[PDB]
Design a protein around this nucleic acid. Structure first.
Ligand SMILES: Nc1ccn([C@H]2C[C@H](O)[C@@H](COP(=O)(O)OP(=O)(O)OP(=O)(O)O)O2)c(=O)n1
Ligand SMILES: [Ca+2]
Lengths: 350, 929, 349
DNA sequence: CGGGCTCCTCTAGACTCGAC
DNA sequence: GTCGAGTCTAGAGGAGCC
């Protein structure tokens, strides 16, 4: 229960212990995450987007409405697959009817538990039937590597081949939570049945190009839970330290001062620099209720803050600022001019 | 009656085949010899054993030209290699004008007439050449320039990538990117390399150009062993040293100093073609081409001094024909090769980062022991460098907000300009300890990765970081005695060592797989995985963290040591025009696919036993479910319409040693106990000697091969015990010694083999008992006395196997040419022969290979005078007919990089292994169409 | 009407032409957005986040659910204010009982029309009554500056002062669409009434340090529409060319095209540009080719800053044709200086 | 007394070369 | 003008093959 209390103290999970029952967190009946939790979820979404949509020439974003009107009134969505399949004909025009191509979307879906809300990342991968199993294996490996490369213990991310009630091939991704393995991502090799049902009539519209051959694509659907993924990463990260990934740490750097007026302007300039660079900074030069250095170090360790920048009296003399990392617990004296390049390189090369 | 038996009741060759091969007129062994053989067999308790007859085979073999088998082989080899001997003699009678002073700066080939005039020609258009090729290593594998020596005129070649400066050239090589050459003969020092840059050598259909190698003939005439090479190099800087003055290493400078002995060879100090860019080559064109011409001239002189000696010491034409046929290796590939490279590299990187995550976490958690000087209480990390270095020192309104931002930025900029105060060279992590500094790359590195990325299990601090322990004792490294562990005190395993002098501790080395003399260099070897699983070797974190490191090390060990070789393999992708119509019209042909080939850079005679040597393809691991990228050979896939038809000889050295011992004892098959044991056994019943050993001792059949071949060539009983304990962990030290005495002191079964081998070895001029090829001049008793005894005794059998390979190659080429079999030689491992045949002629190729094996066995028998051949070894057990290249036709090649197998990831199905009884039914017993 | 047709064709808006209408776009009942529209809204959200939450130590994200349980039988949320007000107590501990602070959020809000879903960017500012109107005016000026920063004609982003029935000062930002003026944002000074209603009694928990004394802050509402903002920017940016601002345009460079080596060069350039953070349209994958005028028209209607062409001459010298959306001026530059040029151009504006 | 080959990574030594 | 960071070679140990 130490992880939940640390999340409460560092604003990852809101509410008291009553609302922090792990069943509530898994189901989605919990209240919203804290600002640090929101930042961690946003980092996960950004990394997922970079891995799936940005670096693929055939994957495009898609916007699916949160509600599904009609057949007797409308309902709220439970999966992102339906809305993405609703845009297949329209998005065929982007890739000039070439296969494979994908539609991706990160959003919130509602399922009965009380209504539990889950942040889900989906990828509908229209493929010719010839290489559908090959693409399923490739996406299994790719998504498993994506989950593992941000984890301190990649062995806790596993896979399991599974068959649907109709015999459709598929795979399931799990994380080894302390209580048990909970499903976090599911790949199904759905055929053309969903497309044919959603588009009754002529199959000429759905004809994609497999090389020089027209064919109806096989819907490889990938759905991943980002709230449960964030909780899994919080468990994986957890001297009490949340060793979140440098590309997933909610707060990259916390700047503190150890000449009240001059150091304030120095820290303000460094704050503006790192921010414009693209690095979110926790202001540690504003806390009137100052504490000892060890207490600040413990607080920053519990907050998954990668670096603590210290501006002292000697900084004005020679420009050297102390810099402590979350990993070795050792700080290093580096010049102000070189701080932005070092931080950017540390974040990018991670 | 086709069934025949010898005086020892061993089923001999069928009557028809015996009459076709040996004809008639053989001499009976005599009553005394039969009595001696029966007495020996009854003494060893083998005369009363029965045997199940094998089905007889009736074949209309191709008409043998000569009066007997030896004359037939001589005629075949002379017909095969007659033009090339003439070209070599043309080289022997060649005089050239001095090299031109002004080399031509033009793309293509240039012919230099008298006085140095440069004439552009399309091709040298000659029958014999001396060839050297220079390649800009920093640019790729495309050839840069080449100089060729013909008896009439010099020739020089310059590439398009050396005369023209371009922003970027294509990285996928093509026949248009190679040197245009081509009955022609090309001579070079490492001609295999120079062969790989010829445009016409990558065509699917074969060519009549053969290549002669200076290193191969040097090894044939006056070669040196690896230990001999080391001793030669040490002496250039065992009581026998007469071999030094007549031998040298394969370096062209040393070879020219040996065979010619003129002025020392001139080597460029800059080495621009290796450690330089294309601009340096363009600036120093004349000097580099002059060096190439000098190397070509030295090679020509060495060839002139070597060829008569090689013909003297290897007078059998089959030797030359097989050395020429062994240098035309050809391995087809496709786009699956590129995909395999990508997948293997990706899997290697994934496993590497998976291991490095745990390693970096352990290292980072160890930096906290610096605080409070707590490292003095850690048994693993009390002797590292924990020292830290000091750093080297020589509601605001819009206007108000803008002014505040500008002032803050200017204050930062003013303090930003203080960079001149600090030294130019950035200090590498002064704050962290020294052991942590050594594990971190510097920021200047373009491939910088955060954290201690420069860490691996092979380093000397990893076991201390992982807190590996042996029987509850922390691991300790001794520079004198390798690894080990510290027992508190002041246990008997591997003995104590007082040299470490650690206060209040004892040092015991880890058990090495090769005895107490050897030292363990890393606890993460494959031999320590059973000890990690058992519990003697444990990690501080415990659980799966420990064993997973060794598992991943085993998985990625091969790719770590072979990715540079495999990825850098010179692949030339043939266009659609160069491909045959059969490949294009086949259903499996892919329009968007690639079809190329890899020419192995094979040194035909790189061994004192005249064996071949290739850095990669003769070291290529077979497919395994644990080693990453172990499907290397499985990626050699035949083009559409083609199949890789080949086979492996069964129990080669065992049969050669047995037949030699029998011929020494009496002119019959199965005279000695060892010969009788070798013959009595089938491979479909699992009763052959290798399978019998694998049954008697629980080790696998490959371990049985290792055990038998060690015991043959002088391995002692302690070696047998160590091998048994290594390959079977259920055996104890006392139990393993029982099985060592059971197969060593109970042998004499193999006395005649030893007698024959020591008779050939101690002879003044040792020769192969089949083709008469002599040993290297640096191994004759007049030069080495009693030294190198094991090498010389093994040389007889190994060179006999090489002669077997030569005979197989000659016979296969003859059968392919005579009956119009569409195919070519693919690659030959030390006892394997792969042939790239079309799908329509796979069974004809199989029958041809069976006939070749029969003829080679009969030749081995006849040259020893046995005048007959047993039916047990007269044919191949099974000839593989597969599209890809693998040890067995049924393995699907599942790998960490190839998890779905060859059938799912690629389109490769499983082939068939067929015996003679099935090949005959498939082709009606005739090689003709 | 032409702009909506271009947006539908160029995947700025999804769905059929008949479904897409002005009223449906302004009410949130439209079928949705295409990939280009999604990326444009994502750029808008990123810029708004950088302008509000970033560059300030007092603004924090809000995590409010889409439904409000409990008796009013839950209902879909209509605004992001309630989540911030519920997080008010914990955020005081987050700022260590300081004052003032903010709680800004971007999310989908549900409004009856049918079900109309709008992406709204709100800003709940908690300030003591001493400096209420000062912070209100500061937020008004900063929001108007942000809206006018990307506008080709910033005179169309109007601002007005309106008084509600309750009698509280407020502002209403607008955009001058061709048919008329539509409300894209609205500011109100609600006060502490909502917080008192949501926390009846025990005002000691709501106290914050306004310097030395303890005060219960008021509530400031700065609620805008990012979908209406996207439509306003599309109309402001409209030879058929969508001159979007570089910080908002979804696709920066279009890359086109010996097929194999040219494809390899284009792939390398594509990888470099993507790794450096520049979105590229992979037009070189298309085997089918049309007139370069058609390509330029397509890339102009897609609000693509530049079109890069790799040809046979590139292998020899490394020069690539570069076409500018704004100036229509073609030039030849080395392929190794394209990334730096694009980064400098983006940073410049 | 196994034989004949292949090559890698790591560590130590020697060396050099520049920076202060 | 001394000294620390590259550079290079070499030797050992491990690991593929037959
Ligand atoms: N450890 C080894 C392995 C092989 N060889 C030699 C002896 C063989 O004659 C030759 C061929 O290798 P194989 O292992 O293929 O030997 P076989 O052909 O006898 O194996 P099998 O017949 O069981 O396929 O290599 C050796 O001396 N020592
Ligand atoms: Ca064999």
């Amino acid at each position: 229960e130490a992880l939940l209390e640390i999340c409460q103290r560092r604003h990852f999970l809101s509410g008291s212990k009553q609302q922090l029952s792990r069943d509530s967190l898994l189901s989605g009946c919990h209240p919203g995450f804290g600002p640090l939790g929101v930042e961690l979820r946003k980092n996960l979404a950004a990394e997922w987007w970079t891995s799936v949509v940005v670096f693929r020439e055939q994957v495009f974003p898609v916007d699916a409405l949160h509600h599904k009107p009609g057949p007797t009134s409308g309902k709220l969505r439970e999966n992102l697959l339906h809305g993405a399949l609703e845009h297949y004909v329209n998005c065929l025009d982007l890739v000039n009817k070439r296969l494979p191509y994908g539609l991706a979307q990160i959003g919130v879906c509602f399922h009965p538990v009380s209504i539990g809300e889950k942040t889900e990342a989906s990828l509908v991968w229209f493929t010719p039937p010839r290489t559908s199993n090959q693409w399923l294996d490739f996406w299994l490996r790719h998504r498993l590597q994506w989950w593992r490369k941000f984890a301190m213990s990649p062995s806790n991310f596993s896979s399991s081949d599974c068959q649907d009630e109709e015999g459709r091939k598929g795979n399931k991704l799990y994380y080894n939570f302390p209580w048990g393995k909970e499903l976090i991502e599911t790949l199904w090799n759905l055929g053309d049945h969903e497309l044919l049902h959603m588009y009754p009539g002529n199959v000429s519209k759905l004809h994609g190009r497999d090389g020089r051959k027209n064919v109806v694509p096989c819907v490889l659907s990938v759905n991943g839970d980002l709230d449960r993924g964030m909780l899994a990463y919080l468990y994986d990260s957890f001297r009490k330290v949340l060793k979140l990934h440098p590309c997933l740490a909610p707060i990259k750097v916390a700047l503190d001062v150890g000449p009240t007026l001059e150091l304030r302007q120095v820290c303000q300039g460094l704050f503006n620099e790192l921010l414009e660079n693209g690095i979110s900074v926790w202001p540690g030069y504003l806390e009137t209720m100052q504490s000892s250095l060890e207490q600040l170090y413990s607080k920053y360790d519990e907050m998954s803050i990668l670096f603590t920048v210290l501006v002292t009296e000697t900084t004005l003399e020679n420009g050297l600022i102390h810099l402590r990392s979350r990993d070795t617990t050792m700080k290093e004296m580096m010049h102000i001019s070189k701080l932005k390049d070092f931080l950017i390189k540390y974040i990018s090369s991670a | 009656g086709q069934l025949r038996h010898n005086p020892l009741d061993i089923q001999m060759l069928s009557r028809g085949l015996h009459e076709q091969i040996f004809g008639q007129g053989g001499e009976m062994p005599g009553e005394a010899a039969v009595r001696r053989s029966v007495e020996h067999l009854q003494k060893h308790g083998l005369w009363g054993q029965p045997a199940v007859p094998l089905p007889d085979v009736e074949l209309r073999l191709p008409p043998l030209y000569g009066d007997n088998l030896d004359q037939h082989f001589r005629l075949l080899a002379q017909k095969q290699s007659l033009p090339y001997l003439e070209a070599a003699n043309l080289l022997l009678q060649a005089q050239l004008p001095p090299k031109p002073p002004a080399w031509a700066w033009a793309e293509g080939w240039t012919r230099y007439g008298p006085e140095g005039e440069a004439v552009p020609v399309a091709i040298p258009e000659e029958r014999a050449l001396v060839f050297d090729v220079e390649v800009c290593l920093a640019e790729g594998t495309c050839p840069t320039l080449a100089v060729a020596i013909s008896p009439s005129a010099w020739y020089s070649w310059c590439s398009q990538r050396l005369v023209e400066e371009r922003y970027s050239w294509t990285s996928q090589l093509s026949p248009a990117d190679l040197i245009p050459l081509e009955e022609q003969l090309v001579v070079g020092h490492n001609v295999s390399f120079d062969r790989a840059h010829i445009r016409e050598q990558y065509l699917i259909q074969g060519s009549r150009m053969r290549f002669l190698d200076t290193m191969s003939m040097h090894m044939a005439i006056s070669g040196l062993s690896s230990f001999q090479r080391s001793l030669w190099i040490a002496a250039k800087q065992i009581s026998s040293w007469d071999w030094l003055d007549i031998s040298s290493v394969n370096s062209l400078a040393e070879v020219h100093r040996l065979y010619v002995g003129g002025p020392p060879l001139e080597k460029e100090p800059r080495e621009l073609f290796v450690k330089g860019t294309m601009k340096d080559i363009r600036e120093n064109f004349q000097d580099l081409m002059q060096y190439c011409a000098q190397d070509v001239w030295a090679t020509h002189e060495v060839f002139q001094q070597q060829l008569p000696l090689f013909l003297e010491r290897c007078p059998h034409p089959v030797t030359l024909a097989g050395m020429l046929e062994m240098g035309v290796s050809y391995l087809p590939v496709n786009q699956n090769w590129e995909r395999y490279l990508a997948e293997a590299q990706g899997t290697y990187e994934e496993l590497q980062r998976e291991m490095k995550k745990s390693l970096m976490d352990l290292t980072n958690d160890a930096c906290q022991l610096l605080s409070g000087e707590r490292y003095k209480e850690d048994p693993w990390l009390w002797d590292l460098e924990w020292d830290l270095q000091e750093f080297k020192q020589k509601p605001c309104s819009e206007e108000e907000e803008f002014q505040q931002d500008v002032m803050a930025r200017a204050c930062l900029q003013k303090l930003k300009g203080t960079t001149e105060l600090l030294p130019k060279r950035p200090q590498h992590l002064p704050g962290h300890p020294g052991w942590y500094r050594k594990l971190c790359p510097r920021l200047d590195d373009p491939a910088w990765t955060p954290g201690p990325s420069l860490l691996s299990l092979q380093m000397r601090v990893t076991p201390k970081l992982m807190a590996l322990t042996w029987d509850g004792f922390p691991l300790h490294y001794s520079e004198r005695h390798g690894w080990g562990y510290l027992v508190p005190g002041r246990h008997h395993g591997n003995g104590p060592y007082n040299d470490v002098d650690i206060p209040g501790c004892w040092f015991f080395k880890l058990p090495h797989k090769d005895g107490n003399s050897c030292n363990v260099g890393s606890p993460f070897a494959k031999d320590f995985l059973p000890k990690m699983e058992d519990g003697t070797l444990q990690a501080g974190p415990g659980g799966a963290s420990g064993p997973r490191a060794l598992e991943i090390n085993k998985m990625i060990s091969f790719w770590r040591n072979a990715h540079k070789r495999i990825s850098s393999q010179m692949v030339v992708w043939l266009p659609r025009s160069a491909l045959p119509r059969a490949v294009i019209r086949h259903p499996d042909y892919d329009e968007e696919g690639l079809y190329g080939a890899i020419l192995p850079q094979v040194v035909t005679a790189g061994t004192i036993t005249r064996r071949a040597v290739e850095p990669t393809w003769l070291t290529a691991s077979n497919a395994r479910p644990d080693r990453v990228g172990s499907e290397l050979k499985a990626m050699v896939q035949a083009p559409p319409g083609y199949t890789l038809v080949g086979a492996d000889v069964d129990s080669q050295e065992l049969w050669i040693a047995a037949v030699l011992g029998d011929a020494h004892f009496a002119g019959m098959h199965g005279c000695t106990a060892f010969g009788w044991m070798t013959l009595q056994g089938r491979k479909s019943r699992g009763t052959d000697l290798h399978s019998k050993t694998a049954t008697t001792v629980g080790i696998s059949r490959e371990h049985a091969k290792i055990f038998n071949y060690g015991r043959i060539y002088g391995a002692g009983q302690p070696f047998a015990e160590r091998l048994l304990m290594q390959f079977n962990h259920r055996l104890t030290q006392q139990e393993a010694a029982e099985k060592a005495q059971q197969m060593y002191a109970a042998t004499g079964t193999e006395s005649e083999m030893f007698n024959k081998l020591e008779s050939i070895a101690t002879s003044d001029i040792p020769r192969t008992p089949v083709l008469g090829c002599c040993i290297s001049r640096a191994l004759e008793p007049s030069a080495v006395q009693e030294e190198f005894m094991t090498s010389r005794v093994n040389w007889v059998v190994q060179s006999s196997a090489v002669d077997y390979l030569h005979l197989m190659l000659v016979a296969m080429k003859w059968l392919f040419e005579e009956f119009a079999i569409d195919g070519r030689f693919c690659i030959s491992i030390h006892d394997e022969v792969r042939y790239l045949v079309r799908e329509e002629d796979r069974y004809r190729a199989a029958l041809a290979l069976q006939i070749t094996n029969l003829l080679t066995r009969c030749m081995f028998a006849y040259k020893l005078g046995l005048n007959d051949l047993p039916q047990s070894v007269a044919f191949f057990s099974a000839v593989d007919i597969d599209r890809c290249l693998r040890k067995e036709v049924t393995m699907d090649c599942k790998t960490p990089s190839n998890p779905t197998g060859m059938e799912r990831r690629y389109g490769i199905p499983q082939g068939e292994a067929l015996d003679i009884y099935q090949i005959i039914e498939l082709t009606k017993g005739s090689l003709e169409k």
